[PDB]
Amino acid sequence: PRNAPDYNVPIDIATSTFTPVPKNVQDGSEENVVPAGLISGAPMELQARTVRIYKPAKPATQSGEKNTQLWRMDWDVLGKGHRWENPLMGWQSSADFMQGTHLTFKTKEDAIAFAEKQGYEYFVQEPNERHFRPKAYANNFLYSPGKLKHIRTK
Amino acid sequence: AEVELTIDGKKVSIEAGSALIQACEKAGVVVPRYCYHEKLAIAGNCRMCLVEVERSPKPVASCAWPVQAGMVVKTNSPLTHKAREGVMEFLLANHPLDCPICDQGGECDLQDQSMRYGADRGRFHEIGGKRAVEDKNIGPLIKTSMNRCIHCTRCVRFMNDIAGAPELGSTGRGNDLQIGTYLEKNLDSELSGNVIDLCPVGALTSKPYAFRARPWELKRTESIDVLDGLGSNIRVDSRGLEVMRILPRLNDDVNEEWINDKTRFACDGLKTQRLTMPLVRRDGKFEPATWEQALTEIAHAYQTLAPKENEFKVIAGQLVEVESLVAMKDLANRLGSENLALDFPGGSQPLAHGVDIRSNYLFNSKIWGIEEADAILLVGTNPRHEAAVLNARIRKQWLRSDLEIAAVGQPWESTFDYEHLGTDLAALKNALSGPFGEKLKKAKRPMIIVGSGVTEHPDAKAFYETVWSFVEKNASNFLTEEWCGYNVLQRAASRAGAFEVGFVVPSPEVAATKPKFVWLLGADEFDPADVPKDAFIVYQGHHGDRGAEIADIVLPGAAYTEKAGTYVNTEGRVQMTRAATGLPGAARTDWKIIRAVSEFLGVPLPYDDVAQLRDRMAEISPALAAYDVVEPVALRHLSKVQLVDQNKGAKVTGEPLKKVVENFYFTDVISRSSPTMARCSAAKETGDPRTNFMAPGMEEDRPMGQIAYGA
Amino acid sequence: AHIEPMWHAWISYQVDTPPTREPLTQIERPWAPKEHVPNRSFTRGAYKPYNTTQPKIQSWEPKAAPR
Amino acid sequence: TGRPASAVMQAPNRAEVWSRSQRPRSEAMAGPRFEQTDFDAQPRPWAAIELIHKQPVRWTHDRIVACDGGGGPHGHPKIYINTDKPEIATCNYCGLPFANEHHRKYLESLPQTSYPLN
Amino acid sequence: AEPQDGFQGTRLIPTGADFQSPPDPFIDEGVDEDSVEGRKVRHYTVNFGPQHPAAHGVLRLILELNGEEIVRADPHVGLLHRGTEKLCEYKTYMQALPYFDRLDYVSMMTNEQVFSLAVEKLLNIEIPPRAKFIRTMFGEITRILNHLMSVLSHAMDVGALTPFLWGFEEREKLMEFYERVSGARLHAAYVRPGGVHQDIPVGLLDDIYQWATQFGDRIDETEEMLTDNRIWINRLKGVGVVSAADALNLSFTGVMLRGSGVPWDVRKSSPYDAYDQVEFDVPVGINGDCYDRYLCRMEEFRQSLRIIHQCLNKMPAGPVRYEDYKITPPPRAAMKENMEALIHHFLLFTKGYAVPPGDTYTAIEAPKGEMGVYVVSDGSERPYRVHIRAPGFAHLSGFDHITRGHLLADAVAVIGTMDLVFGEVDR
Amino acid sequence: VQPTKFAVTVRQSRNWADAKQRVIAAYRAWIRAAPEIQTMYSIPFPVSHIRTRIRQEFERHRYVNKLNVVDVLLQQSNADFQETMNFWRQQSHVMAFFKEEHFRGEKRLPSNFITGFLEGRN
Ligand SMILES: *P(=O)(O)OCC(C)(C)[C@H](O)C(=O)NCCC(=O)NCCSC(=O)CCCCCCCCCCCCC
Ligand code: SF4
Ligand code: SF4
Ligand code: FES
Ligand SMILES: [Zn+2]
Q: Which residues bind [4Fe-4S] cluster 2 per the record (chain B) (predicted)?
């Protein structure tokens, strides 16, 4: 009923105290899409959590752009169960089975097709691109008829 | 126009007057570079971009070579190969063998392009040794390991041209050339931390992020800055449940590869004074409590008071997302209250601009509109302190065009020349009809930026009708098909979102009613007069600050780094933050605290999944459904009815326009909890260039060291 | 585990020079153990690990303002 | 815990922590696991920071000095230290002190110094 | 239009039972009543395993028996499936190499040889001559080590217990050479893409020659006990007999392939390393039974020894590691002295080397049969897909076809003649 | 059933009349077998609870209108039937299909908004 969480979904073996309540579970009837999440053997929790499909931004730290070339699908962090401190060694424990899993896709529609095939909730983030502007070494030495208002220092 | 040319066979279509390296990028060709940056002036110093061009006996520097109508470029010829190995051999001859102790390790362009374009081994074995240079004290934020300098000049170009802070230079000659102020000085620029990201190597590193993490171990989240109203796009790098560093991500519409120092260093204030469990004030002392019996004592107190219409008041702070505004708006409405105040002074009374037309309170000629601005009047705004990255974009346009800036307000220390017209409203009326007015009247794409600091001025009703009446008098120049010269500049990331959902006081009548119950929803900058002393105070937030000090209940929410909140920036762009970590302790998502206290007060807000709460936001404002885009305002001329029609008889008092940012470093609760901003303020005040100013490290007067950071 | 470390290399045929003529044992190291401690499990002196780092997030120390 | 000195003092040579995120042994060795326990059997190495600052300065007539850690290929990657500030310069990898002979007068006049200086 | 056309079932996939063809009627080679012929006989099932020897650690084979003879044999494997092929996708290539030591855990340096040869082929590099000979010498030391386990554990199951102990001193001596080149008695991690990790120590080639002078006498005395012994002969003759046509159709490799009269060794047919530089023979059996496969394995003892002696005399000088620091780690001394070397050292131990895109199937003549790996590369520093082809996995799959009608005491002999380590079978 | 006692050669449903015939024969075998599953695996539940729980696992896929999806869902059933009727599954795998033998029990998602809020998402 319009984004209402189905609190009466039948849980499975891997459902936990960190599993969110899903809204929609692939019935196996929806048109034009394979109900792969129904026959995958994955837990129901995959159908409750949202994934983000995006093109990774270039690092601010360096000018290589190899990692910006492919779309990544990753799972969003939950408010509880992602990381806690181990009482013994101080290590970071987790309940999130998807924390280290990411998928790579060549096009945005390839990722959307996979998300709908598996029943994921997905948010797509449109890439941020540059604005082209001709840059000329010669401008560094343009002539100012008036006040300088800038002392270029190489 | 477009020239056409071939690079490695393939035709590329690049505008005439651009550099070859720009066409190589457009053609899908990777060209090694160190000195060249897309957003900095061209320098030909590194020599790593040397390519082979037909009809040219020498290799040319592609970064500085303009594209011509018919040239042929080979980027993989044997000329190019031995060129790149020879430069990579020179760039590494005097480079310190400091990769295990370098912070740039694992994310270094010198390392990667040595692996890709250099030789596998080195031929430098001099008994005479390598160059070594002393370190330089250039303020608290930046740690220097200058032996690593490859002399790209990226930081001197950034500090001199983008930051307008010409204290960094290059003293010396030849191999003994050095980067740094000749006399030790504290780099004084709210953009100075960008030099650390710009550095190809780790000669400029951050003192806070000194040796804590390796880049490979960090989870990267693309989120939004909420420490200012511009909504800057960032990357939050975290190792487990602790945020390690905050980097800038590209968005040419907003922040352009740059973030200010507050948004980069305030993240250490996210692990220091956090609210992690519910608190109840018992006998004047805050006791821990559970959620079931802190929400109960909220309800019991509310039943005891039995408030009348508008006696339940909310004050929304400056880091509050739109989801919790809509939820708290609903729960407020079901309680018979429209008393929806805001943190700033004057925020508990109706605002001089309305919220009826979206164009009333937005930066209407979008942030990208400055790139073509011809004349700019700044009213009640020190943009260097209120919107740092925006201030830089103004200077970039000023340095390259015939841009005229005039300001009415308090004079500030500006990175661009500006005419000062006055400080009060008469000095606006006298300016807008004076010599600078005809600059606005004559110059195409005029721009009037009205600071959110005038909204809190007592004369804002007079200020706002003064401005727009000039805009309406001067349309077809201010109000063309694609241009709007009216722009209001937010400084808090929550204001535009509150205005969008109508989270404001509607009438003077509701404003004069004394509340018996105040929900301080992340509100910490409230004026004391806006909270009656005897009222019942609930504080919902994430940091223990002024708001929690006066609360009767304290409810711990989430910081912006562990919620996916919706925020609207000053230009009207609706962006979404991504949670990088989870909630600490017993904190709860902010919109869920509201939804639960709906059960305890008996008026449960319908939605109980965040998907449903975003459907509700769509009913209030459909633009809130559009993500990463500005929705244009259609009835932009209808704005006269709030700005001029409902502001006609204004009781002008003549008080001058006031500064809003006493301390750029201490603006919000995250900043004030930050040790790094503590050092930034103290170093600013005492003018200390020492890197270990309140930090670990050996000094003249600390032979032994110190483990305190921030004190 | 009762064998002292440099003799342990000799008994294992890992060196031919015994610690009685090996210069590497004649390094002065005031931090070096004074007595040979053997394997100390199964005894009340067994090694117990612990966290060496401080808790990540500092919580607010509640201070109620006066009324 | 508490009663033995080894459970209380961070290292045998040093009593206090030497970094801001280091856990004191008093708080690390509290709790149930450290009951019915020998604290003198617990691993307690000598603190390196105290030992490095007991090191005498290498006086040198040169602007740039080379440190490889002192064992040939058994040290650290060879680096170069500049000794032109009137302070003691220290190798980033090993911590050993270096100082130019030109600053001996100034360095000998300071009241407290980060290295023995003789 | 799969999967759309498959929603309504408009197409059926042509199964092999569709293309069945009747045999030619002319040249074709070879009911209910009161009698007891129509009567049926019940069978009972038996749970065999785990046996005492280490190699058959996790075997749960369920047999159906008609009296004494085996009707159908159903091995249940997976008891040592540890997810190696998945864990290899989250590791760099150098990090994934130790996973290969732990596949056939009695033949370690030849497991890591097939992974190195696969990665080296995608790297498009030629490894130096010295590492080629080091690898072919330690690949035959490995083959001797495995056969000492396989032959002597086989005879320990059959009930001869003394040859096992004699040859495990020979095994005990040959693991000293593993621990001198590396520091491991079992998992060396020594063979790596681009050659070997470290040069052999300076007195090892003399110590292998001293071992060599007496190893044949060890084979001869082990052979004194089993080869002509009638009890041994009468427990392996006619047991586990596979035809040459069926060994190929069953995916059999190695002595399982070679004991039925098929002359075929990967070393001779697709030479790798320094095998084209050494003279050795290939034992091929006649009757396809366990006695042939025992006699073929003993002959390989003498042939591997003959290769090791040749490798000692052709050991050339030079790098034991591909001379390129973008692929193999620089010397410690270079990394501590030269800028480029520390950069290449740092990036190889954090990111790893990139392998160019593509896929390769690479096989070697492993001691248990043919061992191969299918590696998909994505042009990055981690393998996109690693698949191990294990000779024993195909051998155990043909256990039902080979033990059918045999006795259970016969089947224990068939388990040992198939060189079976279950960490190999389950990857 | 040539290689194993309950083996069925992998077959592809020819049409919906065929596919529904196979589903009903699969359900029939499972609910027939429930007494045999309850003694071997010593399930401390009524045969009725086993049968009603078998029904739920078919009731999940009652609305599948794809013929290619039914065959994989049928093959999964046949394979599950084979490993249960041969004593290959351990009692631990079988009585772990019943989602009330968790120490948290059947109630493992929060019932509504407020009860999951007071417990921190369950
Ligand atoms: P009626 O005509 O109303 O319904 C008949 C059917 C169900 C065929 C529908 O008409 C129909 O077309 N539905 C879609 C087809 C369908 O049902 N597909 C799936 C069939 S296979 C299936 O559902 C397998 C379920 C699991 C099998 C195992 C169950 C027991 C396992 C655990 C037992 C207890 C522990 C050992
Ligand atoms: S700047 Fe780069 S190359 Fe230089 S030491 Fe640091 S990591 Fe190594
Ligand atoms: S300090 Fe860094 S950015 Fe500045 S010139 Fe040197 S290498 Fe370039
Ligand atoms: S990129 Fe053109 S010289 Fe540095
Ligand atoms: Zn040193």
A: 149, 152, 155, 199
